[PDB]
């Protein structure tokens, strides 16, 4: 084994160690520090890097400054930090944004090791060095710390997930049972089979993206009249109930943001967080009664309504995503090759161009009716004046 | 079957249609256009989309307009965009940015069905329908058309690729090989094992992150000297082969930039567009020579270097990732698991540390010479006046 070690203690380097069962293959089969020691001034490292200063510090000042930049934040002393843990902070000192900060400085094992080496010298510890120490003597930190912070989070991460549930669930059912979609969809096939001369157009169906095309032919006539101008005009007095699509597909357009990825990482969070709270229930249940902890208490409460509610989460979600899957096949795309804000945002262009074109062709309608207005003034006008010349020419 | 054609000719709908095979779970299934015909006023539907306007036009009018813009930019007529195809562009008319615009506006299967059905009347065709109706006629257009294009980015694409290959080959031999980070590392771990008392330190290596956590411990005399600031000073004396290591590591900022998914990326485009461009020289050559018909001319002497010059690619990227590999197993790191960005990262930052270290360093030596003249000259300028005392009391 073979190396030296200090008069007095020394500064830790904060380093990672490689288990012995990776090397063999490495530049440490060529190293060897134990002659180093011989070589080195080791009265002069442990004169420059002494843990003491006289406070004693041992943990890197990174780290160390890291913890007394969130301590002079957090406001709180050691016993108060404990007794916000233990009580499931019951007076609110501890926020969301500083449990969050508070779970990434806990305390390693490896910190813990060398703060041991040193537990009859806390009160000549440095503020990080004792905090760090302190929070390591709290049964279960890390897990009571991580179930205080998703017990806070978790009312606003179902209320983030759950409308992006609904607007799948609903956005699904509606493009599977819009009969103004139907019927559109029947016009515009013929619309194709005609149009399309001889093959090209013997169609039975086409792809759903195909909507976003309408717009694309252009009258011979007027040219910002395209076919889907034309269409939503045709439709008024032939197929009336086709424009009662933006009502019918009306959660398509917040559906087509659902963002699948960040849906499914968003239960993945509520899921594992829940079972790790479930989990640390368990743990402290069976554990005896200590004054002043009411961990079992107060996280009995909340798996009775987290459970519940989570469950239904869960529901509405495999339902949701059942519906998708029919209302996929419905229009003829592959079921796992296509996502909410694909399928729905070919949708939610469509219905952005049909409102469009409803509008533009409402403000053409409102020239054919103060241009009309000249032809029955001028028509009226014309012949006032013709029955006083008829009348200047009898008289 | 049973739908109505026009008297005239109409413009185009651009919709894609499903495969009948893809129906019976669909809307279709419910969906019938043939009453549609008899409700709708087809005459209307005729005259106002009709193909005439007199300039025949069926393309629809967004990808119509958007070949106009090109091929005002292009400013080529069709006979001379066929020459610079058929010549592979012996006369330059064709740059690189033209013909990966070119190779968007390509004639589609039911783009050619259709101007086919006029196939008599291009002297009425609008321009972009004439101009896909002509790049429709010319053998196998969209494969010279990429033939050339590849062609013409090839140089600038091997020059992209290399670099990034020399960088990870280069990198993973230095690291491996630098005498400098090895009599580093053996310091270091001496460092550690005496720092960091009892357990906590009896390593036989360290993970190499751990370098970029030296200087986060801090001297307890001085806050600013780092222990890698006292690493840099102590090595001068004791070790000074270890301050060639920014020397030894000198292509490890450049290694640390490479991003493997975009350097594959990068061969998967040229391997793939390579094997398609000698697929279309099989083709053209299996062709009896036409004339103005350069391109088995052409694409011959490309192959000739161009198969050359990739194939030595692949070699030196198949050697740099076995390289990468033996470096990323001799400082103990899972391979498979972590890539060159990373890996390099890790070095680079600590190089980018030791050079920082090394001018603060640097600075303090020259306060440190700045004021030993102060103790030099104050020093023999107290003794002057001591002289001319001890004489004036002697006098």
């Known amino acids: 084994k073979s190396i030296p070690q200090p008069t007095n203690a020394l500064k830790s380097f904060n380093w990672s160690k490689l288990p012995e069962n990776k090397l063999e293959g490495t530049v440490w089969t060529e190293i060897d520090d134990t002659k180093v020691f011989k070589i080195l001034d ?26 007394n930049i969130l301590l002079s934040r957090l406001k709180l002393s050691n016993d108060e930090i404990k007794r916000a843990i233990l009580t499931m902070d019951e007076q609110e000192d501890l926020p969301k944004d500083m449990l969050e900060q508070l779970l990434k400085f806990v305390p390693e094992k490896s910190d813990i090791d ?14 990080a060095d004792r905090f760090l120490f302190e929070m390591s003597r709290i049964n279960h930190y890390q897990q009571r710390l991580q ?45 194709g089979n005609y149009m399309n001369k001889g093959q090209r157009g013997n169609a039975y169906g086409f792809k759903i993206s195909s909507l ?14 395209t076919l889907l101008h034309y269409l939503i005009t045709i439709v008024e007095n032939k197929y009336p109930s086709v424009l009662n699509l933006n009502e019918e597909l009306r959660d398509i357009p917040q559906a087509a943001k659902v963002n699948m990825t960040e849906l499914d990482k968003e239960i993945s969070t509520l899921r594992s967080g829940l079972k790790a709270v479930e989990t640390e229930l368990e743990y402290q249940k069976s554990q005896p009664p200590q004054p002043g902890d009411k961990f079992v208490s107060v996280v009995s409460q909340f798996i009775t309504v987290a459970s519940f509610s989570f469950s239904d989460v869960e529901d509405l979600l495999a ?4 519906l998708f899957t029919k209302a996929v096949k419905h229009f ?50 014309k012949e006032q004046r013709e029955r006083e010349r008829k009348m200047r020419k009898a008289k």
């Open 42 to 67: 080791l009265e002069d490292l442990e004169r420059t890097f002494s843990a003491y200063q006289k406070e004693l510090s041992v943990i890197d000042g990174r780290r160390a400054q890291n913890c």
């Open 114 to 127: 060398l703060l041991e080496e040193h537990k009859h010298e806390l009160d000549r510890m440095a503020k």
């Open 147 to 191: 179930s205080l912070y998703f017990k806070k989070k978790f009312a606003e991460r179902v209320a983030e997930v759950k409308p992006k549930v609904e607007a799948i669930r609903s956005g699904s059912e509606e493009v599977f049972r819009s009969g103004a979609l139907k019927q559109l969809l029947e016009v515009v096939l013929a619309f």
């Open 212 to 225: 976003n095309k309408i717009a694309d032919t252009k009258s011979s006539i007027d040219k910002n009249i």
């Open 319 to 322: 339902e949701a995503k059942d």
């Open 332 to 381: 003829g795309e592959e079921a796992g090759k296509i996502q909410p804000d694909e399928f729905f945002g070919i949708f939610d262009q469509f219905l952005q161009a049909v409102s469009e074109a409803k509008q533009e062709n409402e403000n053409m309608r409102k020239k054919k009716e103060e241009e009309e207005r000249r032809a029955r003034m001028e028509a009226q006008l």
